[PDB]
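pasting Major structural subunit of bundle-forming pilus for the record, 158 residues
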Amino acid sequence: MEQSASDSNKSQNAISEVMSATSAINGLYIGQTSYSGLDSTILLNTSAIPDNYKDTTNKKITNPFGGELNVGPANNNTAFGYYLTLTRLDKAACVSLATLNLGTSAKGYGVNISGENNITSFGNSADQAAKSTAITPAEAATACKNTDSTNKVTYFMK
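structre below
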């Protein structure tokens, strides 16, 4: 109730985690242009067409590495660095990220998108669309919308 709330409080804590993630993974690779090399391997690794870009149950976010992770590089480091396809989600997490601020401390957020290598264009809404900034109940209403069996989100985060 009353605004996103987590967009100011929870965000400050989330930033630390992800900014440490991109730092850690980078320190192990040393740029590699943009973790290049993993692409060719991982792409054909899973069915040649990585179905992991989406979960069929309700739990996959491409970003973290706390559970079932799949490593992959993006197009160009500056635009997008890396993506890790982690299966894991919850209805609360859907609202949590939409009540966060995924814009200043994110590279992009896309719900029901598949193809982390080259994410779709970013607007400001969710579901079969990606957005540049995530915030306010408006996003929350759009992110958690018909998303049950189709509840999966690839998202690059800084």
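The radius of gyration is 15 Å.
The first helix runs from residue 10 to 29.
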